Design a protein around this ligand. Sequence first.
Ligand SMILES: [Zn+2]
Lengths: 93, 261
Amino acid sequence: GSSISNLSMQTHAARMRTFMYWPSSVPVQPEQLASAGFYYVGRNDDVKCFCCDGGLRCWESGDDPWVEHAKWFPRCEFLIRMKGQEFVDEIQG
Amino acid sequence: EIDPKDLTFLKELGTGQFGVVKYGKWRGQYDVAIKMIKEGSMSEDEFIEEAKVMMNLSHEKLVQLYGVCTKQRPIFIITEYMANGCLLNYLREMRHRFQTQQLLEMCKDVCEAMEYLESKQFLHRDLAARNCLVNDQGVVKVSDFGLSRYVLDDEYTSSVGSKFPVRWSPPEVLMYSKFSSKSDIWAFGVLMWEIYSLGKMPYERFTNSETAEHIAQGLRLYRPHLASEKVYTIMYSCWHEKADERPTFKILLSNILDVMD
Ligand SMILES: [Zn+2]
């Protein structure tokens, strides 16, 4: 019952350093992704959650990283702790 | 006109452009996709009339439109079920370990659908990997053909917009909104590039505004590593500054068949 998938990406700053070579074509900002537990894997617009290992790509204009996290990875321990169960079930509904 | 009672809804497929798309059954046990149109997203009266023209488009590499449900809201768009979804995601999934011959047939499939559309004088207006679909057999089919004509969202309509397909537009579209068979040819060349780049974003290190100014001064997409010198000559011919110097889909298809291995 492992809680964290990537310990080296537990801090917001560590997730921010991965976004150094983040393509300028992506219509979502590193700060918004890092806050939502995501780090850049170095290929295209692929991000991974440090807690649930949930991978997200093909980001569109107006995409909220917190909404997408709850949309595709609702069981994420980090997501529930930061946003609460109420927010998760709201996106699933 | 399909009766909504003669339709089943079994699984949700996605929430891309226009709204929610669901998998279900039609007459009795026919595999279908039901596109549900979100309120205020489409010039509805105009789409219903064009749907009658779209019903008559019938090709092996073109996503077949079986019918519509327009006597209720939301409007249902009943189509051919494509189990492997959008081409873009299909390309980005590295597990596939595609052969360059498989990448060429994806180009052949799109070019055949685009040759049929050109022979019917129908323009796609938004040709890209995100708008192509993949079926159970790995066959690529052209979808959402001419649909941008009915999108009400201001971000997708304006050339400097947040959702305009800038990276798939020729210089005359960005600068003067000059749409023609040649703007569909340009986008096809970009789509060929996306395929050989395994779903990489065109001009990834540029913003929409940087892309627009650089292509106008002759900057073109580099040769993808998987693309041979002969394959690159084909996609490159789509990007000629002069629209009349670009080939038709008929010429491109013979060019693609010429390098089949
Ligand atoms: Zn997570």
